[PDB]
């Protein structure tokens, strides 16, 4: 009935704690200490964090929960707008898009997405098969690398041509620093301070704005029809309303788009190749599986598929590290959460998934290890207990594609490199609105199989 | 690329191989002088066995095999019906009994049956703790008592009451004298001298039917809800149709279950307590645990959570010989298996489990050694070198069940007696379609630990 607390700040109350640069790891220590659900207060704002399935599966029933915009999700909504992610189901935009949308994203649609990817995980490995001995990897750098360059050739045909930068694209400058001060507003009054802040985060959206704005406008002029996001956003109706989307909603998808891939992926990427490092026996079996599988010079996307065990480890390292590591949602109604915790209305809820994916109750006692095989049998998996990809018609849209890009650049890397984690990297997990291994870097030696 | 068979009978082909009371360790032997894969022919039926982890990894590739019914489940179907053991992928009912009875067996179903688990496991202690001095104990035959009253109690709330019985339940005379049936047709078909069986065989499919089909009726005449399968089942609706099960596909289900109960896991706690008094090491390792964790009178279901070295050595024990020793495979489409060996759409493949579980690449040299320790990271074992279970989908949907009941078994027959293997017993596996070490007989010490 009474819900626990972390310390508060007076009249800040929770607000401090967020302060950090790890918040959700902080928010994780919390949930250690408080358990399956705690009340979070902020000034004008309170929600309370989920940890348990038990609780979980009841805020992930959409009868009675809706997706709500966290914090952060308003926040990036200055620059995503009525895009999926940070649209509310409600919103007209939402469903939309979604319908419009959802066959682009599925694993149907991933043979379509399949050679770009392919592309893209070549030049991966390309790079990597290129670095003199002793020379190391930066692996969230080279996967954000692949992971954005992936979504800008398969969403809009555009070559980030991350893998000839060392200084990021100006569309990337820009959102990576509307992120930055989209994250930085949580930490935060608004003091004349941030004016500096503030201009910079409109002429960041500013940009954004106007370059994606280019990419559709320079579509639009072509005609070129591409297998891409684009094309499908610009031609793609609607059943249900019968409507495109607008010039406006298709900016913002790519916005999202863009951001989803360009980091959320890469540390999916990065956790799984830390995780394989740290685990020599899980790297062995998923590196056979990847020799097994892959035996030609290109994975098709029937190999991918076969890629099973490389699937469990991406599981496994999105239970431990799930990069997209919260999700908020409302009451609908009046409601009971877990027969104790009365709810309103519009009360908020955030799912807190790596503790949701910590639950002891449901994965046993060994949550902190990891352990592909957890997933060898999916359905061994109980409902809601597992929810790296969020809930419901509200669930990642580009799941499919971050897990078939994931799977197909981790067969690669796995078929073609040993891995040595030669500095025994200690995990630091840097936190924007993701989450990523900071500083993450292996030694790959190449198996000297040719592409 | 040639695929050696063993020595054929003319007509008959291979079929007399199988025409012995122990066709699985005569497969074993089989597969000792061929190798991991021989054709195996009957009139108008041919398969493949598989033996080597090589092999059945590219089998237990659900995108390219699907459970075949191999002849014996065939048979068995004839009075297993549409379970789910012996209904194919791709029947309404098994993807629907699937939804439907996957949470009640899951690791958190088995919380709740943990109660039910004990209540035959004091059983068991009880009658050990009240032999007499220089009584033996008869294992499998009281494993059988154990694991058919635990799945009785724990699947339809029944009481078999093994434990009070010398003489069979007379559903359990009909199952058993059905599955004897079943396992002679392999061995056999249509002469005269075969009709005896063929109005036995339905005699006692109509006693097994009728029996349950009385289980099935006089819980929904009582409705009275149980936490057991017999209610989820009666209740559950598949999430997908959103249809539950119907009453004959639910009496199917509770054949299985009560087949699966019955022998098959009896048949792991048996080899279990064999093989630990073989090793006596391994046994007293085994013992200790249990006097370690099993701190109370009554095993709670954290601690058999806790009894990982018993896990393990159930683990060593289905490795060593898995109780449900076979499954059977086809190949969805035409495929190449192990690079060299063509199979055709629909081609079969039996995966000899325990000849994969003495794959030497696998395990090592010793793998006739009974080293639970093998299983101390599963990581570390190779992808499908290890399915006592079977494979993906359609693998044991009773496992945490069985294995949840023989840890808390086992752990309490560590936990309470010394044990002697006092006659020197020299393994006999009898084969019925379930492997058990026959007449294997142990003297129990109490050691006076009170429940
Ligand atoms: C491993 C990578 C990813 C993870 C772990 C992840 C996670 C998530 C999560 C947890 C949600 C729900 C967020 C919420 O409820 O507030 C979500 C939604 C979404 N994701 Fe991802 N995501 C990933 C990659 C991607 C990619 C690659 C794309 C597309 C380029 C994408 C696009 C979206 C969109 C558009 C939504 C909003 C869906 C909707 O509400 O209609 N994501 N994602
Ligand atoms: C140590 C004991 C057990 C072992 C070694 C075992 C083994 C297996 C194997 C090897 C399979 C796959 C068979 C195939 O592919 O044809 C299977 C399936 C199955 N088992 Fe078990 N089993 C055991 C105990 C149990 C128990 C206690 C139950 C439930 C009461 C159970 C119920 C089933 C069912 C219903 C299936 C069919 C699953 C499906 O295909 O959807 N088993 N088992
Ligand atoms: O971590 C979060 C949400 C994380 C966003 C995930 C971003 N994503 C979504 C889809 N792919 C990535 N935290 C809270 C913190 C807070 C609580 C109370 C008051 C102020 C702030 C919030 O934003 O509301
Ligand atoms: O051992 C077997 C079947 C395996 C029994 C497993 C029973 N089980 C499954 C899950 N829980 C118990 N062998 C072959 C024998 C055969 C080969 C060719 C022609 C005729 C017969 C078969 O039945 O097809
Ligand atoms: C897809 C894309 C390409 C360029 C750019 O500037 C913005 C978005
Ligand atoms: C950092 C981020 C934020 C939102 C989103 O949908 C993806 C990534
Ligand atoms: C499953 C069962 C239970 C009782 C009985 O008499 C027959 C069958």
Known sequence: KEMPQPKTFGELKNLPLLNTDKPVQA?????????????????GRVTRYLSSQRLIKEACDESRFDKNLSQALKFVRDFTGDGLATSWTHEK?????????????????????????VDIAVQLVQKWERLNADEHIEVPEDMTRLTLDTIGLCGFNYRFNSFYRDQPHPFITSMVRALDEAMNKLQRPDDPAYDENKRQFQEDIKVMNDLVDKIIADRKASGEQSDDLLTHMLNGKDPETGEPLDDENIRYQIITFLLAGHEVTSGLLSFALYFLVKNPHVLQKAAEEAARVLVDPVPSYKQVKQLKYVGMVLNEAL???????????????????????????????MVLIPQLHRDKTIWGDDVEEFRPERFENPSAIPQHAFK????????????????????????????????????????????????????????????????
Chains 1, 2 share one sequence.
């Open 388 to 451: 790296p990809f969020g809930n419901g018609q509200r669930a990642c849209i580009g799941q499919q594609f971050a897990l078939h890009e994931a799977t197909l650049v981790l067969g690669m890397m796995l078929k073609h490199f040993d891995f040595e984690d030669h500095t025994n990297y200690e995990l630091d997990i840097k936190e924007t609105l993701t989450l990523k291994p900071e500083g993450f870097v292996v030694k790959a030696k190449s198996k000297k199989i040719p592409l």
């Open 319 to 349: 239970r431990l590290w799930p990069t997209a590591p919260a999700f908020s949602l409302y009451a609908k109604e009046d409601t009971v959460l877990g027969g104790e915790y009365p709810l309103e209305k519009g009360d908020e809820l």
């Open 93 to 117: 935009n939402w469903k939309k898009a979604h319908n419009i949308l959802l066959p682009s994203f599925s694993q149907q649609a991933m043979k379509g997405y399949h050679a770009m990817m």
């Open 27 to 43: 928010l994780m220590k919390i949930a250690d200490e408080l358990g399956e659900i705690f009340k979070f207060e902020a000034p």
